Amino acid sequence: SSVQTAATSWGTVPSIRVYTANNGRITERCWDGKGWYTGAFNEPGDNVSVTSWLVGSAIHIRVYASTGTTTTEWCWDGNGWTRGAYTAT
């Protein structure tokens, strides 16, 4: 029926990130005040959720990507996407 999205934003501009699960893969579109561009995030998933927080001006993002019942956390902490410690049980 349809793609599934998750969105987060931060700061005053703001920056926005929209994650889209489509056909088994999640990709990312980004707005930093001037226009939309494709982000670095690209991971398997049929479902996605996201949360983010600032430490000063530094953004931290957590993306929860699920296939089946297997949910992987992906972390942005300023220097690339890394696999997080999240486990579902």
Place this chain on the structure above:
Amino acid sequence: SSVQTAATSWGTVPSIRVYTANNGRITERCWDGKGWYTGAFNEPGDNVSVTSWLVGSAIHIRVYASTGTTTTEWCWDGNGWTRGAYTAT
């Protein structure tokens, strides 16, 4: 099969907005501290996500409404819902 929701909130009261995709249409329920009422947002979609931010006391909301793989951004900036610049590619 079940309806799909997205939620955002802001301020200290807080205000809450809950968007529900049901049978191809997304509608909005709103809480501003006293009770729930039906909001102005009404757009096609099978899937919904949302983010929001304050500029001072002014709320800005972005709702991402998807059908198929077609995602439309809807913007609240204080003066009605407008179509945003978001594109998926």
Place this chain on the structure above:
Amino acid sequence: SSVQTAATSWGTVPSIRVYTANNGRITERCWDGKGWYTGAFNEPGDNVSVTSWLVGSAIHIRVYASTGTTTTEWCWDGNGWTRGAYTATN
């Protein structure tokens, strides 16, 4: 197909809560800076969304749990999960 999740976070640590709808039930995993543990939230639902806000250091969470077209709001205000006033229509 897959499980469906919703996530929220607050504060500087931060605390994170991830809600997962799986096979008709929503459960909660929690991070408070040291590790992940299973939270108190456990309610029926095929779909979940969440929002939260701080009042000072006190967290308030609202989880919207849906089955069919019936959405129930669950509230955390420091003293257990309670059913909220949310209704989907008049």
